[PDB]
Design an enzyme around this catalytic site. Sequence first.
Site, PDB file in Angstrom:
ATOM      1  N   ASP A 185      34.581  51.753  49.262  1.00  0.00           N
ATOM      2  CA  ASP A 185      35.609  52.593  48.716  1.00  0.00           C
ATOM      3  C   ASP A 185      36.897  52.104  49.371  1.00  0.00           C
ATOM      4  O   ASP A 185      36.979  51.924  50.586  1.00  0.00           O
ATOM      5  CB  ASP A 185      35.361  54.092  49.061  1.00  0.00           C
ATOM      6  CG  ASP A 185      36.307  54.972  48.277  1.00  0.00           C
ATOM      7  OD1 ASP A 185      35.979  55.311  47.132  1.00  0.00           O
ATOM      8  OD2 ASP A 185      37.448  55.234  48.717  1.00  0.00           O
ATOM      9  N   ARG A 226      46.713  57.518  44.433  1.00  0.00           N
ATOM     10  CA  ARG A 226      47.052  56.642  43.316  1.00  0.00           C
ATOM     11  C   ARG A 226      47.404  57.514  42.138  1.00  0.00           C
ATOM     12  O   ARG A 226      46.919  58.637  42.008  1.00  0.00           O
ATOM     13  CB  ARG A 226      45.925  55.778  42.792  1.00  0.00           C
ATOM     14  CG  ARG A 226      45.299  55.101  43.887  1.00  0.00           C
ATOM     15  CD  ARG A 226      44.251  54.203  43.333  1.00  0.00           C
ATOM     16  NE  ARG A 226      44.084  53.342  44.469  1.00  0.00           N
ATOM     17  CZ  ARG A 226      42.932  53.015  45.001  1.00  0.00           C
ATOM     18  NH1 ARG A 226      41.785  53.416  44.433  1.00  0.00           N
ATOM     19  NH2 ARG A 226      43.022  52.250  46.078  1.00  0.00           N
ATOM     20  N   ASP A 261      29.891  62.373  46.116  1.00  0.00           N
ATOM     21  CA  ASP A 261      31.159  63.033  45.912  1.00  0.00           C
ATOM     22  C   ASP A 261      31.922  62.708  44.642  1.00  0.00           C
ATOM     23  O   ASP A 261      32.871  63.425  44.281  1.00  0.00           O
ATOM     24  CB  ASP A 261      32.071  62.720  47.125  1.00  0.00           C
ATOM     25  CG  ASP A 261      32.247  61.243  47.380  1.00  0.00           C
ATOM     26  OD1 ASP A 261      31.534  60.405  46.813  1.00  0.00           O
ATOM     27  OD2 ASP A 261      33.146  60.872  48.113  1.00  0.00           O
ATOM     28  N   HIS A 262      31.549  61.618  43.959  1.00  0.00           N
ATOM     29  CA  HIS A 262      32.333  61.125  42.828  1.00  0.00           C
ATOM     30  C   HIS A 262      31.893  61.559  41.445  1.00  0.00           C
ATOM     31  O   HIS A 262      32.630  61.332  40.480  1.00  0.00           O
ATOM     32  CB  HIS A 262      32.394  59.573  42.857  1.00  0.00           C
ATOM     33  CG  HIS A 262      33.368  58.983  43.893  1.00  0.00           C
ATOM     34  ND1 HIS A 262      33.345  59.086  45.215  1.00  0.00           N
ATOM     35  CD2 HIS A 262      34.497  58.249  43.597  1.00  0.00           C
ATOM     36  CE1 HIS A 262      34.376  58.479  45.738  1.00  0.00           C
ATOM     37  NE2 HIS A 262      35.076  57.960  44.741  1.00  0.00           N
ATOM     38  N   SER A 290      41.345  50.140  43.399  1.00  0.00           N
ATOM     39  CA  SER A 290      39.968  50.448  43.692  1.00  0.00           C
ATOM     40  C   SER A 290      39.175  49.212  44.023  1.00  0.00           C
ATOM     41  O   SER A 290      39.376  48.193  43.365  1.00  0.00           O
ATOM     42  CB  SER A 290      39.393  51.130  42.465  1.00  0.00           C
ATOM     43  OG  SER A 290      38.004  51.414  42.590  1.00  0.00           O
ATOM     44  N   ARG A 311      35.923  48.839  43.328  1.00  0.00           N
ATOM     45  CA  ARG A 311      34.735  48.795  42.460  1.00  0.00           C
ATOM     46  C   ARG A 311      34.360  47.370  42.041  1.00  0.00           C
ATOM     47  O   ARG A 311      35.097  46.672  41.332  1.00  0.00           O
ATOM     48  CB  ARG A 311      35.012  49.713  41.236  1.00  0.00           C
ATOM     49  CG  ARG A 311      36.239  49.299  40.399  1.00  0.00           C
ATOM     50  CD  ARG A 311      36.538  50.303  39.295  1.00  0.00           C
ATOM     51  NE  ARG A 311      37.135  51.486  39.882  1.00  0.00           N
ATOM     52  CZ  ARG A 311      38.021  52.224  39.215  1.00  0.00           C
ATOM     53  NH1 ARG A 311      38.378  51.919  37.970  1.00  0.00           N
ATOM     54  NH2 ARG A 311      38.583  53.285  39.815  1.00  0.00           N
TER      55      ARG A 311
HETATM   56  O1  LIG Z   1      34.150  54.410  42.800  1.00  0.00           O
HETATM   57  C1  LIG Z   1      35.204  53.761  42.591  1.00  0.00           C
HETATM   58  O2  LIG Z   1      35.655  53.471  41.458  1.00  0.00           O
HETATM   59  C2  LIG Z   1      36.026  53.213  43.703  1.00  0.00           C
HETATM   60  C3  LIG Z   1      37.011  53.899  44.298  1.00  0.00           C
HETATM   61  C4  LIG Z   1      37.404  55.392  43.949  1.00  0.00           C
HETATM   62  C5  LIG Z   1      38.808  55.342  43.464  1.00  0.00           C
HETATM   63  O3  LIG Z   1      39.201  54.559  42.572  1.00  0.00           O
HETATM   64  O4  LIG Z   1      39.604  56.162  43.993  1.00  0.00           O
HETATM   65  C6  LIG Z   1      37.762  53.126  45.389  1.00  0.00           C
HETATM   66  O5  LIG Z   1      37.285  52.099  45.877  1.00  0.00           O
HETATM   67  O6  LIG Z   1      38.898  53.498  45.732  1.00  0.00           O
HETATM   68  S1  SF4 Z   2      40.958  58.519  46.604  1.00  0.00           S
HETATM   69 FE1  SF4 Z   2      38.802  57.810  45.895  1.00  0.00          FE
HETATM   70  S2  SF4 Z   2      37.493  58.811  47.642  1.00  0.00           S
HETATM   71 FE2  SF4 Z   2      39.523  59.919  47.752  1.00  0.00          FE
HETATM   72  S3  SF4 Z   2      39.258  61.916  46.662  1.00  0.00           S
HETATM   73 FE3  SF4 Z   2      40.207  60.337  45.286  1.00  0.00          FE
HETATM   74  S4  SF4 Z   2      38.513  59.341  44.175  1.00  0.00           S
HETATM   75 FE4  SF4 Z   2      37.616  60.435  45.971  1.00  0.00          FE
END
Ligand SMILES: O=C([O-])/C=C(\CC(=O)[O-])C(=O)[O-]
Ligand code: SF4
EC number: 4.2.1.3
Length: 753
Positions: free
Chosen positions: A164, A446, A99-100, A641, A643
Amino acid sequence: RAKVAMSHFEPHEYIRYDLLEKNIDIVRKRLNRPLTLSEKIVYGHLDDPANQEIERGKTYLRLRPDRVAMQDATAQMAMLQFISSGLPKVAVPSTIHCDHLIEAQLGGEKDLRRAKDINQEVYNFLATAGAKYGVGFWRPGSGIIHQIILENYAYPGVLLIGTDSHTPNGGGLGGICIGVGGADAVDVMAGIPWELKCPKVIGVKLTGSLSGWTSPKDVILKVAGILTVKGGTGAIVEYHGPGVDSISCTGMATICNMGAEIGATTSVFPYNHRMKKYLSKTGRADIANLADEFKDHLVPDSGCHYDQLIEINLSELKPHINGPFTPDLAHPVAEVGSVAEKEGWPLDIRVGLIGSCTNSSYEDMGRSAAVAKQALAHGLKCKSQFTITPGSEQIRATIERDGYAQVLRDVGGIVLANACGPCIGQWDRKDIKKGEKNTIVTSYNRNFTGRNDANPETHAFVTSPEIVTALAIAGTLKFNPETDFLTGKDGKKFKLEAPDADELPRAEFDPGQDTYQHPPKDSSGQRVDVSPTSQRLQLLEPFDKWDGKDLEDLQILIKVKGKCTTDHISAAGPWLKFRGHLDNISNNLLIGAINSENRKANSVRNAVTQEFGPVPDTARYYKQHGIRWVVIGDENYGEGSSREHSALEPRFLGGRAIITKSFARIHETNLKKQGLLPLTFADPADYNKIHPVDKLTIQGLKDFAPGKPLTCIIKHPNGTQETILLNHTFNETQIEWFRAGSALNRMKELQQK
Ligand SMILES: O=C([O-])/C=C(\CC(=O)[O-])C(=O)[O-]
Ligand code: SF4
């Protein structure tokens, strides 16, 4: 007991409420007190309920999650670490969601076809690694991870971990769903106990009922403004009270989702009739029927104690809009027009974006379509640009069928693919230049600096999808949908009626196209191929074991000032291309952090050359020359996040320790996992004693112990030295990760070689 399967894709994996009950009962005989709902599900999943020490905020629990979910921007590195472990198959139900990596540009089908061509190497790697290790694979186009989980995998009483930070979304169906780094997911897929610091529990009692323009999103926008981004750290938020039955199941998932922005471990709602209804409409009536039989274990005990209680009267709550650069700066929609004016935030809205996992439900789409049909009835279309992200293929096929997608197209909207897209900066945005000050309003969560379009001057506000639609039609923040008038085509002034729409389809959901790929659990003869010249994927080389010595005369790479999110430490957007390539993504290390020496992003003094330059380059220069370095940070370091790249990248470029006033939970765990030392000042005023030019010695690593502080000698250039104490939250499991060089190195030592 009952043999009710955990999902439609795992007919043989049964829900174990018998196990949960048994464990709740061992623990309550030990504690002799009422348990909150989060305590029941979390202590009900203990590996050893009879002997586990249980103190909120103090002990580390060893837990057994029911399943693991991964999305493709974090799955690559979680699976490369799993591939180093050498283990042949995952131990619990696990899924990958693609999805990303789908960039919004042309809209829907066109963007999906292009992403599949562009990201072929990566989708190939994940599908093959999925087939080999027994992980289910949801193909690109399937939907955003958390909507697929609520629709297919989340159920009352589940303990699910996901790589996530918005995995708490599943708390809307009564489960404990917790955000973790890829190495934590590897523990569970490997079958070893997962550890979590025992949470505090914040209770939020909801009273009254939502009316009119107020939506579930306003409840968590208000709670974020109250608790602030660091108020939920180390706690689970547990919603309760008479007002809960007022909220739809996807509405509850919206509120649990954005509890990630106050740093909470997760959020949960008690099992109730709205959840039952949602389970039955998503083909899981048998699971709702079983949960009715175990209902006592799926609601809080009478008289349970919350460490903090907050009460919100839903009947007095009004629409909110939060931002512009933090999600806890909360304003009523009624006043944002005047605060913007006063603060010099751009009033004209260039783009309104609805969707993301936070607000892409059938109800959200119907409420936005209800605002839009009224505008259409007066011959208006959107003044701002307007994008719509469906959360999954089922929601896209059903809103298409029930007519909501066409209303949204007729007011001027573009339907994007079922993917994160603009939410993690995967957006080919061309209407503003970089550095151009402008305002976008989203129904996301965010709104950190440069996250949606890499432009640090984009002012992004988060609100509900019906308020984004109303403001996109007006095109200005100076418009309150509750009070103000629009002028139709015909010249008449008119007011928008508060939206009302069905929470779920009257008919069944239309599932849309086939997108799940089950593992062959027969064959599994897949070779996973990672080309040695790939720019996107690279097998890991193990980090070094600790040398047995204290860390002396450490150079400070950067002393960071203020807010330092994981988007500051390891940016997303264009860098997502390298999420499976550690050396290539390490070129973004800390490029967003503000240096206290000069107030600049990405400009630090090289101590040897005395030139100011990029942070990645300076760290690589120090590593080339054997200079070990440290980062000095402020409060809530690592916010955001999950990550794990924000921890893997400093380890790879020769960092040794990160010393801050405080850490956000997931980043602190990821740091320990990768063999770094996350340390906090015993007196936060000592942050002011350290200057960028100082060298630091961390002593006492030889008798490193839970609860014993480490001594730090600050060596000033003029010859002065000062000793200060640094605290840490390591237990003896974690000290073993440090001594071995990383948790994965420790796991590999336990494999008898
Ligand atoms: O793949 C990512 O960088 C982690 C995310 C998505 C995001 O930042 O919305 C998370 O853990 O929330
Ligand atoms: S908050 Fe993270 S999982 Fe949700 S739509 Fe945005 S990037 Fe995708």
